[PDB]
Amino acid sequence: PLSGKSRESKAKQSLQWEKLVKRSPALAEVTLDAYERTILSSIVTPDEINITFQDIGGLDPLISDLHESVIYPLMMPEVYSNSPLLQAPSGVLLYGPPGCGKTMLAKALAKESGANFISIRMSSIMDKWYGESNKIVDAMFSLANKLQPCIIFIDQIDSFLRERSSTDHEVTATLKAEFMTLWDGLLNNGRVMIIGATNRINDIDDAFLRRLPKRFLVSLPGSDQRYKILSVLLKDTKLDEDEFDLQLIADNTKGFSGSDLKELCREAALDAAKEYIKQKRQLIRPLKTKDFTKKLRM
Amino acid sequence: GKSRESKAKQSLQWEKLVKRSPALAEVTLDAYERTILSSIVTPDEINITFQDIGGLDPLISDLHESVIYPLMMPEVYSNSPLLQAPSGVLLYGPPGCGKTMLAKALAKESGANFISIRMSSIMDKWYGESNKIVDAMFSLANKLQPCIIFIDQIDSFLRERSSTDHEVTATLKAEFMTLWDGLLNNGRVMIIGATNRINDIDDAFLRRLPKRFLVSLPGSDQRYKILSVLLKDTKLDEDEFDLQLIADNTKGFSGSDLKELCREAALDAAKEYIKQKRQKIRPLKTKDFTKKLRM
Amino acid sequence: PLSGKSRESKAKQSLQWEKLVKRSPALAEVTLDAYERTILSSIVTPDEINITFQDIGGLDPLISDLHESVIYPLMMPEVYSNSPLLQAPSGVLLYGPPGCGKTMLAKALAKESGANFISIRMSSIMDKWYGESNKIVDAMFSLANKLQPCIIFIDQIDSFLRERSSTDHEVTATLKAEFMTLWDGLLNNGRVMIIGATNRINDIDDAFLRRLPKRFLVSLPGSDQRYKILSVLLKDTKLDEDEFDLQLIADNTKGFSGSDLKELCREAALDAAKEYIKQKRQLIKIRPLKTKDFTKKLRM
Amino acid sequence: SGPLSGKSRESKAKQSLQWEKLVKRSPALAEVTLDAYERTILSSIVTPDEINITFQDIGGLDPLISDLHESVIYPLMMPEVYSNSPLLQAPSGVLLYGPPGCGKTMLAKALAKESGANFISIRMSSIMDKWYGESNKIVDAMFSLANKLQPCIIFIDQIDSFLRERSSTDHEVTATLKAEFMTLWDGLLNNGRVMIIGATNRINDIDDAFLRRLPKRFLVSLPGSDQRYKILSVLLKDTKLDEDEFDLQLIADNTKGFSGSDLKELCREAALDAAKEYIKQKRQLIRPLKTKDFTKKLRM
Amino acid sequence: PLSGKSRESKAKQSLQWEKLVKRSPALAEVTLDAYERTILSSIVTPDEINITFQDIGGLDPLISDLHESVIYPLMMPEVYSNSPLLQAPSGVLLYGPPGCGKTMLAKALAKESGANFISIRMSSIMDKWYGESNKIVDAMFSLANKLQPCIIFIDQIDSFLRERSSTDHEVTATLKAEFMTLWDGLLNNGRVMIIGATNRINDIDDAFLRRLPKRFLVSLPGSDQRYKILSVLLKDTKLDEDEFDLQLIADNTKGFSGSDLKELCREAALDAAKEYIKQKRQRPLKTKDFTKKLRM
Amino acid sequence: QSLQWEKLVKRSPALAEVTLDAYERTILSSIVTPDEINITFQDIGGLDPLISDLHESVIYPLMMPEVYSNSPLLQAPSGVLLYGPPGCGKTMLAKALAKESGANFISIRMSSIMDKWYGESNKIVDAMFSLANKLQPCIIFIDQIDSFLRERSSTDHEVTATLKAEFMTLWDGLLNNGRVMIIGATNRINDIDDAFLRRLPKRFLVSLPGSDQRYKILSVLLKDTKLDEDEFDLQLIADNTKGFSGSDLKELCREAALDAAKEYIKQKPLKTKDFTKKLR
Ligand SMILES: Nc1ncnc2c1ncn2[C@@H]1O[C@H](COP(=O)(O)OP(=O)(O)OP(=O)(O)O)[C@@H](O)[C@H]1O
Ligand SMILES: Nc1ncnc2c1ncn2[C@@H]1O[C@H](COP(=O)(O)OP(=O)(O)OP(=O)(O)O)[C@@H](O)[C@H]1O
Ligand SMILES: Nc1ncnc2c1ncn2[C@@H]1O[C@H](COP(=O)(O)OP(=O)(O)OP(=O)(O)O)[C@@H](O)[C@H]1O
Ligand SMILES: Nc1ncnc2c1ncn2[C@@H]1O[C@H](COP(=O)(O)OP(=O)(O)OP(=O)(O)O)[C@@H](O)[C@H]1O
Ligand SMILES: Nc1ncnc2c1ncn2[C@@H]1O[C@H](COP(=O)(O)OP(=O)(O)OP(=O)(O)O)[C@@H](O)[C@H]1O
Ligand SMILES: Nc1ncnc2c1ncn2[C@@H]1O[C@H](COP(=O)(O)OP(=O)(O)OP(=O)(O)O)[C@@H](O)[C@H]1O
Ligand SMILES: [Mg+2]
Ligand SMILES: [Mg+2]
Ligand SMILES: [Mg+2]
Ligand SMILES: [Mg+2]
Ligand SMILES: [Mg+2]
Ligand SMILES: [Mg+2]
């Protein structure tokens, strides 16, 4: 493989490998080919992720559905083994408008599911040489089969799994065909899940969409959903006991996404802490509803 | 790839071919045929038979009478060239209708050897490596006389006429298609193709797949059969279950869509039993299925 | 190829890395791969930029809002460490009509801030080789993580972060996806902030606009803003004490952007020194700028 | 490095020939090295020997030529004369606009000959490339090379197509090309004495952000009665005219709406029909031009 | 590029190149790029054209003006090298109503003149890849400069030189801009002449129209002009000695173009040879044969 | 190797030497070969003078160049236009022309020419004309040329304007075609451009059928059908039909037989009364 092979990269690959055999002692005496070692640099261990499922608000019906049909069937196959129809999905699509916690769910998936996480990107798959892109995808599925409870995550999956056409490069179409064959094809994988997140679900190819049968629509938050998101965002922050009305802010932030509320919480936090920060810089305060409505527009 | 696990796999795959047919003991393979041997699929790996594919009995019988039986006993199919096994069989249709399931059943429930290459095992950085791999692939097909060279996703496998295509795949275009023309002599080896976009396959390259097997979206009666095989090994109830209603309700559903519908309905039906065991499976009514569909 | 091994480029990369280690001694002993070394040619040190925050007029509320909400939370995290919502923005967009001072703010951000500045141009990112652009962006985010207080500035960001469509090329569709994943994905970045300037905010994709939560509108100058911009532009320039009236010019420059006032000052100063230039050109005292030369280049 | 463009034997010979002329004109460029992309821009270098047209060959436009000299040429090529004030700098871009045929290309050819600046008459064929990201690198090298040859002029004839108004329906590479051109033109890490002179007959098609990058605008409008006579006299220079019958003033009167190119064709027809008797004698084996020769083509 | 890389094209490109060497031996030492080689497929040698200037009727004043103002200044610079204004035009527009012989004049220009004729079409210019059409146009002008006595002919030029708009395609807009820059720009073309035939002159851009200063109006034939067109078309035909009245047919064809008269002769020839056609499957012309198909 | 090309080589052995490119191969898919259609010149009713004129002015000058080599003005026309009210059988004429005339029919529509990329439509048209030049006796039929050869203006799209100009250039330009002939079957002759109407100088007016023409059409369409001797009168049906196209009589003859059939199906016949029961 004429990719990676850097001093930082090879140190990263060994560092993740010593982590993986530490989480699972059965991963010892498992030989990985050279292409599979380059995939190991994309392994995300739970200590890297600082996001807990409790840090995602307003998605508890979706989180419970994520645990009931995706996490527990994969990570606990001993209790779903009474019938062959209680298996994990071949793929999961965390689609929806931008702002809603699709990557929050994937980060919590990387931390609390317990499965090995491969947060692979296009830079680790695309290679300038002829057959290296295909052998990377072959190794990515092969390594995920060796680490049997694995989740392969491709953020912004609408670009990797875009609709096939005559515009497609010779490598990309062959790359997509190789991904299709290993995903749901001959010589089926073990407990390997391809979890994806995207803003444009319709940009994904129909043959790739059929390989993501469990689709989670993380839509824009409602009035109650925004209140739960604002509560988790404003946790570990001193709010006013009487001069704070979180319900009013939730109703006024109609159409606000999760990231929009975070910036609103951020902008209101520096607005509230303007006096304290200026005093500290020259050398806090309970957050009120007037601070949020100052940056708001009703 | 002569890389430890690859070497172990090729030796193990060759060992499996020995017990499958002891006539191959005297046959010797070189290095490039050995690197193709890692793609050999044996029926022990596949767990999908022809009885696992519902809603496809006319196509399965047509598959047997055109590609399977003419290969296994060509003596009785040599009366006419039409009854002989074609050198190219294409399984095409909308995705999720069982093209791969037919390939899984072809690998398992057939006495022929089953080469299952991917495009990763063929393309290589070094010049001439891809041509020698393809040449050894057809040579290995001649050595294993009842062989099937299965190519999933034919659309990207050397089936494209574009100026952006490289010269390495341009000579791979000719090398594969010249050896394909030589496959019509013996007739005991075919190339089986699976695809969901027949428009991407080149018309000048499609003629070398004369046998076409259209696996369309399931009909009302076909979805009834597919729902039946998907729900086997799962215990049901006999009074409050009407699987006929689900078959008509799932309009436009593919086989993969029904498998997800069956899987999701089974999880919701077993939710109470899973909750007990996490910290007997409840009967599967038609209410769980009809909750998932739009009607 | 990596399109970074040019003789001038390699000397530029070594020179920029020497300045980065000189500014931040902790940047030594770190390891830079081949792709990350090419991004070093896009590093902008404060000695390159000659433009200060004091050289931007009319945007004092915006400059103050830039300091308290963007610069100070990023470069002084210990002041902002008491609350977890006091962090620097993951993205900053300086949008508005052209010629109003978005690059002026970006120049002062490069100079008057301790953050390492990566003013990456798009010729460095896109490459003819397959998958080279994705690794370059991955290296650009990787390098910005090594230089922990960092600013990745992309001028005219509406072309990079354009609204995604099926007509987009595969290399850019993966390039935008790679940029999106590293901007806000699983591997959360450190003090990396991506700052953008554009005239077409609506051309930016919705998923990319959400990655630029802090947005500064550098709109067309008002009557008071035009006077402040004219005063800054006419600094180090002799103006007449009685005949010159900056208030009349500022009110008469309705709809004038900051760049339009610079050209108006450029024409007015050229005609003011035309007699002096003709005397100097024949051989090879600047006349003070009055209101008449500014108004004769202007429309009432 | 190195695009498919500027790789032929003819092109490589042109780049080498253009570089020797540049080194001969400016001896300081001998030590200057260039990247493979900057070499391809060298084929677009226009030396004064390639242009046979001077400012004295442009009839009319004398206030425009003087304004071109005092505000564009002299502040650029004589920075020491204009170094007294910082506002006496040369403009970042020049736009010669107006109806076609009035002499915008005449001014650029005269600018290419007797301004003293290195001239890069780039075209869209030299900029656009079929490979991904090469057009951005070509534009980047175009600004890079123009910075090496410090008093440079990058001339883009018909600039309304290169700098067209940006839209969501614009091409992926073209919108990327315009953003890259915008960043290098007026962005951080500003250029030196690089000038971007543009000539077009559709000013309103130019983008607003590109039009603000062309602050010095010259309107080469349709010639007036006195301007038509000055163009007519220059066109009829080195041509025999009748001492009594010819009346140049009268012909200029009944050429209302005639551009400079229309007068050239009128002169071409009048000179050809006056010499037809001489042409017949020469072909088988010129009287002075009169007023009736011009009026037989003119409409009264 | 890739358009001029197919074996049929390269065979034509090679064949067209040698025909220039026999016609002009000085072109043997001139080398060409890949883009320049593609344009060579549009080179029209005089052997391809079977129409001379003698085959054009009713346009003798225009042909004489065509020779005096277009052909001779371009092909005899030494004859005209006494005044700077005695030069070939930068462009020639053969505009008028259809059928009057604008393309026939270009055919005679291709045959009865030694100028290399690049009869480029819009399909040879436009390419699906980015910037290839601009490089093709650059090669088209550069090859014509390497073939110094040259004529670049674009038939139906109103589409190529259409009025520029903000709604124009980006590649088309840059194609027109690249064409205008090379047609009249900093780099002066050497004896390169662009001739165009069109019906919608007003659809041509004003900046493109100034690059076609010499304009020939090939209008509908008059009563006198219809006589020569009829006579030239009816050549190599027995006609009649006393039963033929060409003046009567010419006067009865008001509003008839050359194409209309050509098919009028074609229908009359079929009716006159109607008896001989039946005999051959198993005659002198008459005025009644022409008046039968005519509508008076 | 394509199915159309082997049949073309089998009919004309000289086509084996001729090499084709990709766009010509794309044009090859629209080649109309006489075996897959069954429309016959003798199945055309009421147009026998038009049949004779079409034959003698189109087929024999184009298919028999040895016969017409005596005079330079006996050549085939550049184009042929079949225009008139709809339903009179212009498509019938084109299909029968494809059958009996052995010229390699190229029946393209306004769908194969259009491509989503820049320049591929003009290249497709150029390859269509080049393939027509290669298959020297040929007819390029374009149904509904009012869509293709619409009158030019300043408001047309750039792709369509370039397509029309490039088609005009190949139709009659410097490079003269061989025995290449183009047929358009339109309903509106005024919608065609003046220059495009010029390139179709052989106009054939397929007008509304007259009484004699209506009688011939009714006689032809009633083939393989049982008609009464004295109870059935085709002259009365022909006279009663006023302003009726050939397709209307196809609808009439099918339905009039059906009305006689349904009373015959009820038993398990066709008279002038049965024809005029629905005919008003
Ligand atoms: N439901 C939520 N609850 C709490 N915080 C949230 C929620 N949704 C978003 N956020 C906050 O906003 C940020 C936005 O990132 P997020 O994971 O939502 O991206 P996304 O919308 O999935 O991304 P993409 O733009 O690729 O679609 C999160 O990191 C988190 O801080
Ligand atoms: N006819 C069928 N009978 C039973 N199950 C089926 C059938 N078709 C599909 N399925 C179910 O759906 C799954 C997906 O089918 P499969 O992979 O064979 O589809 P495909 O048509 O080959 O897809 P693709 O074109 O996307 O590669 C199967 O593994 C099986 O569970
Ligand atoms: N507020 C201002 N104060 C002083 N000078 C200004 C101001 N705004 C603009 N200028 C002048 O105009 C130029 C700044 O243009 P700049 O590149 O920042 O524009 P922009 O608004 O970012 O637009 P664009 O995106 O088109 O580049 C400088 O030369 C500067 O002298
Ligand atoms: N002012 C002028 N004085 C003298 N000659 C002129 C003048 N304007 C035009 N001409 C003559 O007409 C020709 C056409 O002028 P030129 O090419 O400069 O036009 P332009 O205004 O740049 O138009 P376009 O927009 O078509 O490029 C010149 O080459 C020159 O011979
Ligand atoms: N002056 C003429 N003498 C003889 N025949 C003529 C003359 N003008 C036209 N014709 C006949 O009519 C035809 C006109 O075709 P031509 O291509 O020359 O027309 P055009 O005027 O250029 O129009 P278009 O724009 O429609 O192509 C000629 O091919 C020829 O048969
Ligand atoms: N003259 C005719 N003789 C016999 N049958 C005819 C005649 N005209 C029409 N028909 C019948 O009616 C059908 C419709 O006619 P056809 O489509 O050929 O007419 P058209 O004028 O070309 O139509 P359109 O303008 O609508 O395309 C024919 O297929 C045929 O069955
Ligand atoms: Mg995300
Ligand atoms: Mg499959
Ligand atoms: Mg700017
Ligand atoms: Mg010009
Ligand atoms: Mg013509
Ligand atoms: Mg029809």
Q: What are the key terms here?
A:
9% strand, binds adenosine-5'-triphosphate, binds magnesium ion, AAA+_ATPase (chain E), 45% helix, 2 domains, ATP-binding (chain E), AAA_lid_3 (chain E), Helicase, Ruva Protein, domain 3, ATP hydrolysis activity (chain E), Rossmann fold, transmembrane helix (chain E), 6 chains of a larger assembly
What this model shows, in words?
The structure holds 6 chains of a larger assembly. Chain A has 298 residues and is α/β, with parallel strands linked by helices. Chain A has two domains: 7-217, Rossmann fold, CATH 3.40.50; 223-294, Helicase, Ruva Protein, domain 3 (Orthogonal Bundle), CATH 1.10.8.60. In chain A, 45% of the residues lie in helices and 9% in strands. Chain A contains 13 helices and six strands. Chain A has helices spanning 7-23, 34-39, 60-75, 102-112, 132-146, 157-160, 170-183, 206-209, 223-233, 246-252, 258-272, 274-282, 289-294, and strands at 43-44, 91-95, 116-119, 150-155, 192-198, 214-217. A six-stranded mixed beta sheet of chain A has the order 1-3-4-5-2-6. In chain A, helix 5 (132-146) links the parallel strand 3 and strand 4 (150-155). In chain A, helix 5 (132-146) packs parallel to helix 7 and helix 9 (223-233) crosses helix 10 (246-252). The radius of gyration of chain A is 22 Å and the shape is globular. Chains in contact: A-B, A-C, B-F, C-D, D-E, E-F. One adenosine-5'-triphosphate sits between chains A (56-59, 98-104, 156, 197, 199, 229, 232-233, 258-259, 262) and C (180, 184, 207, 210). One adenosine-5'-triphosphate binds at residues 44-47, 86-92, 185, 187, 217, 220-221, 246-247, 250 of chain F. Chain B: Residues 1-295 are cytoplasmic. Chain B: One of its GO terms (cellular component) is mitochondrial outer membrane.
